[PDB]
Amino acid sequence: MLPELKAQAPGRAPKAGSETIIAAAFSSLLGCDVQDADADFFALGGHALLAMKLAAQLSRQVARQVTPGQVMVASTVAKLATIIDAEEDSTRRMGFETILPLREGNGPTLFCFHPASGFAWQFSVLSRYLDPQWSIIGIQSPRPNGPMQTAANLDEVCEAHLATLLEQQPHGPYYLLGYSLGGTLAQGIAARLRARGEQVAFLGLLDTWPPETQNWQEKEANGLDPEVLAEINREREAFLAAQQGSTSTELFTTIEGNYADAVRLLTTAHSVPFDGKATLFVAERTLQEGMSPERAWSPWIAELDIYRQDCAHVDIISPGTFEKIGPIIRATLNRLEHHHHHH
């Protein structure tokens, strides 16, 4: 019979059945209007459930075994059909690895760290709302039973991120992001950079920190409210699970334990501010109702842009806040990038 090229298109105009089953699985899962071969699960809404329904769907539609490093990491739709129909003949560090390349080969690279969540594949909403498909790579991975992830997680996660940064370049203007715990994390990692011999362009970190003093993390014992934890866990258990039914208690145990240890270790973590250029969003939704500054202008960083918006880190990772900060992310990153405002 001899081997067949199997067509293999760059995206549009797939095979007569190979990619047909793939493009259909996506448009039938989350796509709702997908029919390409160069699609991206991340930008399509990949997840432990979505990627599970698709991966298993293909393995059952091709009579093969596809799932491990053969879904949203192997390459793409086209390749997916070439591995389930033809053969793997490839090696792509699945999400189980230390890092997950969501986009590499465009131009402006954006290092997204401090996900404060199980996975970091639900950020494509912003990366797609701000840019068409620039370079983006978030350092995240699953945790079956990380023994050091309890309190030594900050150290491990730190090495991973930095490792990727220093791996792509020694120093230069880099745009980092932070959420929930990004505040503390970014702080430490930041000081390490400025001292490592590099210069940070701008690291945006939103969560909660009004003009007054530190957060309630100063003492988890007398800070961990039954609401904040109940919210973050309610959104994580309602998002990761989605009442789908893919993981008995494995993933659930990892997510609950991930945020639990992270929200319980954030008190022991370090907190060192940088005198550079960063953004800090306040959480009016959880205002202490006791703020009373006096000509501070945020003495923390030499220069920053503190915003005021009634929102909680527990419900700030929603698709609503991401779309809200779409166009305002360009004018802000363009005005802080270099020189003063333009428009």
Side-chain angles (χ1 to χ4, degrees), residues 114 116 177-187 204-210 215-217 279-286 307 309-316:
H114 317 143
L177 210 68
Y179 146 68
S180 254
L181 229 52
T184 41
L185 301 200
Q187 251 118 57
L205 324 158
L206 79 308
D207 30 79
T208 174
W209 204 314
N215 55 23
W216 58 268
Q217 313 294 10
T279 294
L280 161 55
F281 240 104
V282 99
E284 260 184 317
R285 256 249 52 184
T286 340
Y307 282 71
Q309 181 151 232
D310 51 276
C311 271
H313 58 100
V314 314
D315 79 298
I316 210 135

Side-chain angles (χ1 to χ4, degrees), residues 214-247:
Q214 300 211 287
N215 55 23
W216 58 268
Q217 313 294 10
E218 220 226 327
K219 206 142 115 192
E220 55 99 41
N222 210 59
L224 264 167
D225 271 330
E227 294 201 333
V228 51
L229 58 87
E231 294 157 270
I232 57 183
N233 194 56
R234 265 256 176 285
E235 216 92 319
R236 258 88 201 78
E237 190 91 318
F239 166 75
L240 169 278
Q243 295 184 16
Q244 211 252 250
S246 306
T247 351

Side-chain angles (χ1 to χ4, degrees), residues 247-303:
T247 351
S248 169
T249 335
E250 237 53 89
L251 220 170
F252 302 148
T253 290
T254 74
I255 300 293
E256 63 90 358
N258 160 264
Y259 94 89
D261 282 297
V263 75
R264 190 235 213 176
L265 76 81
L266 39 52
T267 298
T268 323
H270 264 21
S271 24
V272 187
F274 179 52
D275 281 38
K277 261 210 160 76
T279 294
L280 161 55
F281 240 104
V282 99
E284 260 184 317
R285 256 249 52 184
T286 340
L287 81 169
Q288 197 129 249
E289 239 276 309
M291 305 129 75
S292 174
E294 186 163 58
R295 313 298 208 163
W297 280 45
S298 264
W300 279 274
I301 313 179
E303 232 299 281

Side-chain angles (χ1 to χ4, degrees), residues 7-328:
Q8 194 244 116
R12 68 215 238 76
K15 234 231 150 210
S18 200
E19 269 98 283
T20 314
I21 51 157
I22 319 303
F26 275 92
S27 84
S28 294
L29 263 157
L30 27 64
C32 247
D33 234 303
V34 179
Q35 221 215 332
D36 280 19
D38 220 345
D40 230 51
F41 234 128
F42 315 133
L44 277 162
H47 210 42
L49 325 167
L50 278 295
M52 162 57 138
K53 268 256 214 127
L54 222 146
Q57 154 147 231
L58 304 199
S59 94
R60 298 269 222 281
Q61 277 287 339
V62 302
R64 220 106 185 162
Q65 265 288 314
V66 79
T67 269
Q70 298 261 270
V71 179
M72 65 270 170
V73 275
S75 150
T76 195
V77 174
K79 250 247 157 64
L80 234 292
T82 226
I83 55 159
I84 68 186
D85 201 327
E87 223 129 44
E88 180 223 46
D89 208 348
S90 139
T91 355
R92 246 65 245 160
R93 286 126 83 197
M94 68 233 103
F96 206 87
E97 225 79 11
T98 32
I99 320 306
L100 217 185
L102 315 179
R103 224 140 262 291
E104 175 178 25
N106 247 80
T109 73
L110 182 94
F111 262 114
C112 239
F113 204 38
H114 317 143
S117 83
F119 319 139
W121 318 323
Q122 60 149 116
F123 112 106
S124 215
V125 52
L126 161 129
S127 98
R128 184 170 181 281
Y129 259 62
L130 61 92
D131 271 24
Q133 46 177 53
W134 66 347
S135 157
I136 32 179
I137 52 197
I139 291 94
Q140 227 285 328
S141 105
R143 313 110 293 157
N145 49 293
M148 271 111 182
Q149 259 55 66
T150 57
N153 117 91
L154 310 172
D155 231 302
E156 308 225 73
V157 302
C158 262
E159 305 274 26
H161 174 96
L162 234 88
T164 334
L165 276 61
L166 292 322
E167 171 49 59
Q168 203 131 58
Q169 251 231 123
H171 62 282
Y174 256 116
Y175 312 89
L176 301 317
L177 210 68
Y179 146 68
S180 254
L181 229 52
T184 41
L185 301 200
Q187 251 118 57
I189 194 144
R192 191 60 127 198
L193 286 155
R194 179 239 178 190
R196 259 291 298 186
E198 75 114 64
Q199 55 244 119
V200 294
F202 164 84
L203 327 87
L205 324 158
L206 79 308
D207 30 79
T208 174
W209 204 314
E212 187 80 305
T213 350
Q214 300 211 287
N215 55 23
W216 58 268
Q217 313 294 10
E218 220 226 327
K219 206 142 115 192
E220 55 99 41
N222 210 59
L224 264 167
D225 271 330
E227 294 201 333
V228 51
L229 58 87
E231 294 157 270
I232 57 183
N233 194 56
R234 265 256 176 285
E235 216 92 319
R236 258 88 201 78
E237 190 91 318
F239 166 75
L240 169 278
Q243 295 184 16
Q244 211 252 250
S246 306
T247 351
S248 169
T249 335
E250 237 53 89
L251 220 170
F252 302 148
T253 290
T254 74
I255 300 293
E256 63 90 358
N258 160 264
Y259 94 89
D261 282 297
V263 75
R264 190 235 213 176
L265 76 81
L266 39 52
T267 298
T268 323
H270 264 21
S271 24
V272 187
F274 179 52
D275 281 38
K277 261 210 160 76
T279 294
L280 161 55
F281 240 104
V282 99
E284 260 184 317
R285 256 249 52 184
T286 340
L287 81 169
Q288 197 129 249
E289 239 276 309
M291 305 129 75
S292 174
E294 186 163 58
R295 313 298 208 163
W297 280 45
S298 264
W300 279 274
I301 313 179
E303 232 299 281
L304 48 75
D305 309 287
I306 56 112
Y307 282 71
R308 280 229 265 283
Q309 181 151 232
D310 51 276
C311 271
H313 58 100
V314 314
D315 79 298
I316 210 135
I317 203 66
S318 106
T321 325
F322 280 128
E323 308 162 1
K324 241 187 278 201
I325 316 179
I328 78 183

